[PDB]
Amino acid sequence: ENAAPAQAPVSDRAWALFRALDGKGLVPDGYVEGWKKTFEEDFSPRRGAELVARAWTDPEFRQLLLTDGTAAVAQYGYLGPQGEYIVAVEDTPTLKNVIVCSLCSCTAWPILGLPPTWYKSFEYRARVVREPRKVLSEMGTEIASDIEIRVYDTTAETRYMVLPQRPAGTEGWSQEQLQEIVTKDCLIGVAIPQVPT
């Protein structure tokens, strides 16, 4: 009849899994709390923003980031789980890049942060590969006719970040000022960096 199976509340199931393993000595002291702290406080799109601001103000670094993203990210010490082989993809006046994991949710965790609910949604996983212009427009980003959209589907171990175009009106800004307008959505590729008015 297509009905859902009976299930205990998800909180009860998740803590049951913890307790079953912990009670057998298989979970080191502090282990899951340590991972929660890493996920919440260390893996962060502020890191990808720092890399973008550096590439925008340092041609040499920009070239390394686009040719050997792993090496560039390692200079900052930001390699990590789900972020060991990095490729940065460059937006240009004729090309807009967008990232997805259509099969699940794969994301460059250490430099983008853990993916948000919308990126893991069936709507984004199904639609952005086939109609990325319409998806971005609905999300609030208009990509003109004149620009190729290229969708990177994260299907193996490459973990991607978008290097967005640097917007007019930011000439001479410091790296801190530039970092501030590079958001998580800019790194995923669904947003373009915005300059206040």
Partner: protein, 212 residues
């Protein structure tokens, strides 16, 4: 596995539930949500009981209606629990007793997997390749939209990894292969029914063959 998780190109979904730069809230929206990834890492890195690939495949093995109605992090609670039962570490009885109620798991695998292919080709940037027209009932990191399609190599990785169709089943014969960024024209994948430009899929060597 041609499961419901292979969602790219499915039609009928509505709007993505986000507008750009909207507040996404905290990393975890419930106090249990850090547990699936943390316990997965216990399994992978502290116990050596399973690979990340096995986690992807056990989630793919959720019964299809169950998958479609289950929020993301809960799918990984169910997947990690399932692997711990299948590996002999935990029992479903103890999980249900601790949980105070039903804890249905993913379905058993219907494939033993397959080894890393013995015959493959090293491709170079700019070469045209076709995705092998093959059907794999176990784990595979090839979305169906690119099966049999032709594209161009934009990158060969400088590292190699175990073949998912083997290591996602815990087999000993996953070997190692590089992967290739293969660029497809949108029209190659979806004909006239697309508004995009190109799609780049990151495909293991063993999924590819020379085109024509």
């Amino acid at each position: 596995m041609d499961g419901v998780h292979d969602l790219a190109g499915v039609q009928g979904f509505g709007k993505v539930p986000h507008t750009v730069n909207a507040d996404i809230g905290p990393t975890f929206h419930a106090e249990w949500e850090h547990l699936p990834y943390s316990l997965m890492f216990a399994g992978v890195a502290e116990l050596g009981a399973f690979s990340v690939d096995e986690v992807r495949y056990v989630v793919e093995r959720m019964e299809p209606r169950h998958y479609m109605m289950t929020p993301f992090y809960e799918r990984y609670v169910i997947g990690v629990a399932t692997l711990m039962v299948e590996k002999g570490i935990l029992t479903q009885d103890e999980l249900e007793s601790l949980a105070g109620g039903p804890f249905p798991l993913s379905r058993p695998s219907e494939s033993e997997g397959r080894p890393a292919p013995v015959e493959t080709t090293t491709f170079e940037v700019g070469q045209r390749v076709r995705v092998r027209d093959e059907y794999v009932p176990g784990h595979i990191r090839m979305p169906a939209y690119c099966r049999g399609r032709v594209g161009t190599i934009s990158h060969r990785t400088t590292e190699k990894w175990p073949f998912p169709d083997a290591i996602g089943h815990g087999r000993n014969d996953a070997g190692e292969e590089p992967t290739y960024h293969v660029k497809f024209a949108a029209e190659e994948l979806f004909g006239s029914d697309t508004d995009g430009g190109s799609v780049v899929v990151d495909l293991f060597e063993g999924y590819l063959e020379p085109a024509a």
